[PDB]
Each structure stands twice: as C-alpha cells, then as structure tokens.
C-alpha cells in the first residue's frame, strides 16, 4: 500500500483509482489482503 | 468498475430476480449489461455463458459474482465501432449507392442476418427514418444507432 502509493504519489498517470488498480495488480491473492465489496467505483480495499 | 456505478449495477441486478435469492436468469444478462453502457452481442455473451440452447438459456441461473465478472469480461472490449465504421456498415442498404437506404431491406437484414431480430426489433430501429419512397439517410441512421 504505502510503497505503491509513494511511487503513485510521484506519478502523473496515477489516479486514486489506479492506486487501487495497482494494489489489485500487485497484491491480489495474498492471505492477508482483500478487495472491496465490488465498489471499484468508490475504490477501496479490505485488508487483514 | 467504481463502487458507485457498481452499486447502480447491484440494483440493476437486484431488481431482476426469481425465487428471491440473488438469482438472475441467463436471458437477462446481456440486456441488463446493455443498459449498463455496453451493447454485448448475443455471440459475445454466449461465449461467456457457455453456449445454452433456448431451453437452458431460459432455465439456467446467474448470481451476482457470475453476472458482474461477465459484465467486466465483455466491458473491457476489443472491436466496438465508430461513425466511420458504421457509415460503411450502414451504407449497407444503398440500393444504387444513394446516400439513403432501402426500407423493406433494412427490415429484412434485421430478420435475415446473424442475430435475427423479430419483426418487432426490426421495425423499431428503422421506422420513420425513411421518406415517401422509403429511402433512409443512413449518414444519420448511423448516429442514431451509435448514440442513444
């Protein structure tokens, strides 16, 4: 989250949207991570 | 999709139910999807439904994380057309070459080709875009199909 967001903070192609898209992209399948309850539209992430 | 528009989709799902438990008929998939900013061909959907015939097309059930992935799995899309594609693809009833289109024939293609429209579907798309002789200015019929 933070590291993708440091990089994303220094970024023009990067939308709070693509922050969560980069989080799904990098993490996804991790046994402590979870996506939103379908709200990609609000762009949110549930985590253990 | 954002949670916002997906909430609107959650409703466009929720409305369309049968036994009352989060269950949408296969049939409804593309049509709900169509309203949700999409025009997925029956062939496109049939791929991501698994080739039912009319029987289990009418009988088989979706649920939300079958529907919403399907929506997405077409939505990020490949070929989907623009004005230039559709003026040629709607010069498609030019009879001589005329800048205006064939009245019966625009109805017939819609019955006769691939994704066979009913009479109902045919007439609705076409009606009143012809003139006295039944020539349709396609250059406009195009924009009508492409936005609305």
Write the layout of secondary structure elements.
The structure is cut from a larger assembly and holds chains A (48 residues) and B (148 residues).
Chain A: H1 2-9, H2 16-26, E1 33-35, E2 45-47
Antiparallel strand pairs in A: 1-2
Chain B: H1 3-14, E1 24-25, H2 28-35, H3 42-49, H4 54-59, E2 61-62, H5 64-75, H6 83-91, E3 101-102, H7 103-112, H8 119-126, E4 135-136, H9 138-146
Antiparallel strand pairs in B: 1-2, 3-4
Helix pairs in contact in B: 6-9, 7-8
Q: What features would you describe in this structure?
A:
This is part of a larger assembly, with chains A (48 residues) and B (148 residues). By secondary structure, chain A is of the alpha+beta class. Chain A contains two helices and two strands. Chain A has helices at 2-9, 16-26, and strands at residues 33-35, 45-47. Chain A has a two-stranded antiparallel sheet. In chain B, helix 6 packs across helix 9 and helix 7 (103-112) crosses helix 8 (119-126). In chain B, strands 1-2 form a two-stranded antiparallel ribbon. Chain B folds into two domains: 1-79, EF-hand (Recoverin, domain 1); 80-148, EF-hand (Recoverin, domain 1, Orthogonal Bundle). Chain B has helices at residues 3-14, 28-35, 42-49, 54-59, 64-75, 83-91, 103-112, 119-126, 138-146; strands spanning 24-25, 61-62, 101-102, 135-136. By secondary structure, chain B is mostly helical. The A-B interface holds A 17, 36-44 and B 1-7, 10, 64, 68.
